[PDB]
Design a protein around this nucleic acid. Structure first.
Lengths: 83, 96, 106, 92, 96, 82, 104, 95
DNA sequence: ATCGATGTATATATCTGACACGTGCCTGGAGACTAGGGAGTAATCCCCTTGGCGGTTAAAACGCGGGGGACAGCGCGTACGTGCGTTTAAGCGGTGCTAGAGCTGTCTACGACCAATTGAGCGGCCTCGGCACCGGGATTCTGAT
DNA sequence: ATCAGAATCCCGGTGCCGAGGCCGCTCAATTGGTCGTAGACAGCTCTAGCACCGCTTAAACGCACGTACGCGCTGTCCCCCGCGTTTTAACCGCCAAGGGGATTACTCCCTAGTCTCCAGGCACGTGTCAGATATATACATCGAT
């Protein structure tokens, strides 16, 4: 299958819960589109780096170490999955 | 017995600040990751732990962004966060 | 047979393994004798500090098992380690319970 | 597949001999140790490269520790490192 | 006659944005640098180019900080920049 | 020995710095905060430069030491060597 | 006869190969790695100098000064992204005034 | 003898702009920029070779590092320029 | 003040799976000997950093008037939070199968190393033209009318 | 719209000093040969990722409604700007000194490399107890009066 419209899968209550963890008390209605766009950009960057690492490794499965190295490359170091 | 519009929101703020669990349902996030990765290379495969790490990083980044948005909304003597607040927060963080 | 280099230095972390990692990590053409001992001592001190703060955090929460939440509390509560690990994300760590003053009632 | 895990357990029991530690926390501790080791080693290698030296000794590691670690942590780590090096030199 | 209280400020803004010279007098900055270095090691000496590099870095950092302060002031529907604006600009940039 | 040299950064200099940054109007309390920010940033950079100098067993701070310290701080300076 | 002429480049292939051997990057180094690296460096230098020359021409000058490099880098989005954290000595800042400060 | 790229940056400038000059401070800036990019690419390729348990830096590692470091248009053009140079070099060096 | 709703904390019991201990093995770390070269140390030189004097002028400090911008108060209306019934898909558990990660074996191309050659690149010297400084007219732009 | 004055732009002249070119030299890149080894490729295993079905139920969703907050407007007053006057110290140049940074030469001891061995640490296995869940419950807090 080819995917098309799964960015709407990040529902409004999910954004509301993420904002509640961040301390936001009251939310305006245009925030959701901006948050989805920010999510799209960040995931595209990280997925580009991880896919580049995988293609260099001659593999076809994105190993968690590839994602960890991709996060480390941009300075968003992540602990708990190796490396 | 309707509560005033502050008090339930603060209860949720306390609940999710004492919690640790992932806030985004897993399958839609997996589908979004697949859709995004489809462009760079076809017929890819993903380990489950890789998607878990992706989701952890996304949730942490979005929580930090929302904290900064809240701070810059408080700066304007407001409580509601608007799109301009997110734009300013990203502009000051040094994101594009 | 004879004593491990950690016992000679009086440390718990493996001096020899750190020496092998320094040799194989492509850092320099030569490696001094005291460099692995010094690095092992520093790593042991940092690990001991993190575990002390995590154990204190776990005792505060009345728990007897250190979990990532206690690591996040220990790191984000201490200013030195927060400067050291300011760009580090901890899986399953949560966030500090901080609420803005203006959002409080009254 | 080597990891710091057993050594962390020994240090934990040496410090608080009544608390366990979850597997996720073990992975986090191992990753933190590896990250600090990598930072210190890279800084020491660059430092030795600037001065046209071809060996990593105690002095470059001390200077790298002073560089990465914040002031209180740097002072305490330096003190412990010099104590361990002195003990090893006396014992050899 | 007098210009209105906007106009001379705008002229200065254009003039100093068009030029590339250093804005801080060299001897005061030199003395400040030597005082600050006095706390870490006594009887230190400085090459002129080292102090010039320090001065260039300070100019760039302060200029960027004032730009961010101007944006976060304009966010609050203000022209004038207050201490709280600089505090917010430094807090969002991860310097506090 | 030295006394109070953070006043050497006079008010007109901070005004000119804000003019390059595009600031049109400045409150009277900005200057002390700017001086504090300057004192902390210069403290960090000078600490790292003096550390690099002390490693080489030198007594003079060279431009290369400052450039290396700045590169370590994540802000890279071009045109002064290295 | 030189490796740069053989590859059709002006940058020194041999010097880059020596620097890669002395930099402690790997125990062995392939033959085409220095050629690839010098080609990439030559392309980047050509792009930066072309933009700087255009900026200097727009200023009616024939010499390239740090101001021209600064303008060329900040006026190109990709190079600005590549050199976001880099500060250029004697470069100045982009002419940019917020519309809110402009008069009636 | 102190080495730098300054005498090569001038040849490229005279090739792309036959009549434009350039000061000494711009030489220092361009030399610093070339050295910085060289060190970034080399360090990234070294880490890349270390991840895959290899001990050789080849054109593959340098190409992947270029793809990682440069923004998309620059990465594509640099990859094209590097692969063209490498294919021209291997075309000639035995024939 | 106050009590009812209500979510949240607290105390206890079953389980369960996840953590704490034992075992066998094998491979990575320790002792020993060798060479050799890298680093420590000592002398030298010169250049480049520090210190002082003087003037002078441009920049900083100070006083003062005022205007315009920050800020507090008020009204309003609308956008967002809360609750409830519905529906939708996320989650979990089992089962399938096959693609592909991972390990091992083999061998040949390829890169380290070493000695001889020489020509490309760097340091130094010289000069002239681009740019900067000065000066003066032209044009723009701002504010009061 | 107008007009005067202040600021800027432009145009030309003179100078000056730094960029461009030329030449000697030296040491670093090239070439040719040898030898070890590493990684490219084939092949085998067996793990786990993907796809699906079914049931359940909790989360999402749509809508109704009320009200708290963002935003626009108005008045006020205070405090920052802009300009004239006074002061001061930054800067340039010039000279003197000395000290320390870079260089070279000598030495010696410290580390890579190889070998031999053996014990510690790490998969596999196991068992048992702290915490998760469930349930009951207590308690403090929000809200309406």
């Amino acid at each position: 299958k080819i995917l098309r419209d799964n960015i709407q899968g990040i529902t409004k209550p999910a954004i509301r819960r993420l904002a509640r963890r961040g301390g936001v008390k009251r939310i305006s209605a245009l925030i959701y589109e901006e948050v989805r766009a920010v999510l799209k950009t960040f995931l595209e960057n990280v997925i580009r780096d991880a896919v580049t690492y995988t293609e260099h490794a001659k593999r076809k499965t994105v190993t968690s170490l590839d994602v960890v190295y991709a996060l480390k490359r941009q300075g968003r170091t992540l602990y708990g999955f190796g490396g | 017995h309707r509560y005033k519009p502050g008090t339930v929101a603060l209860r949720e703020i306390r609940r999710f600040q004492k919690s640790t669990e992932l806030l985004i349902r897993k399958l839609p996030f997996q589908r979004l990751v697949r859709e995004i990765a489809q462009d760079f290379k076809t017929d890819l495969r993903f380990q489950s732990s890789a998607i878990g790490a992706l989701q952890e990083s996304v949730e942490a980044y979005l929580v930090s962004l929302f904290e900064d948005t809240n701070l810059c909304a408080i700066h304007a003597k407001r409580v509601t966060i608007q799109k301009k607040d997110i734009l300013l927060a990203r502009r000051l963080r040094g994101e594009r | 047979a004879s004593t491990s280099r950690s016992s000679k230095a009086g440390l718990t972390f493996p001096v020899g393994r750190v020496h092998r990692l320094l040799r194989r990590g492509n850092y320099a053409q030569r490696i001094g004798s005291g460099a692995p001992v010094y690095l092992t001592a520093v790593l042991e001190y940092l690990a001991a500090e993190i575990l002390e703060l995590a154990g204190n955090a776990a005792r505060d929460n009345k728990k007897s098992r250190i979990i990532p939440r206690h690591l996040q509390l220990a790191i984000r509560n201490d200013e030195e380690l927060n400067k050291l690990l300011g760009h580090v994300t901890i899986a399953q760590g949560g966030v500090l319970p901080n609420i803005q003053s203006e959002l409080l009632p009254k | 597949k080597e990891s710091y895990a057993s050594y962390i357990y020994k240090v934990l029991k040496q410090t608080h001999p009544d608390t366990g530690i979850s597997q996720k926390a073990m992975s986090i501790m191992n990753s933190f140790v590896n990250d600090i080791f990598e930072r210190i080693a890279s800084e020491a290698s660059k430092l030795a490269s600037y001065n046209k030296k071809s060996t990593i000794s105690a002095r470059e590691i001390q200077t790298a520790v002073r560089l990465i670690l914040p002031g209180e942590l740097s002072k305490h780590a330096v003190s412990e490192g010099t104590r361990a090096v002195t003990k090893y030199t006396s014992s050899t």
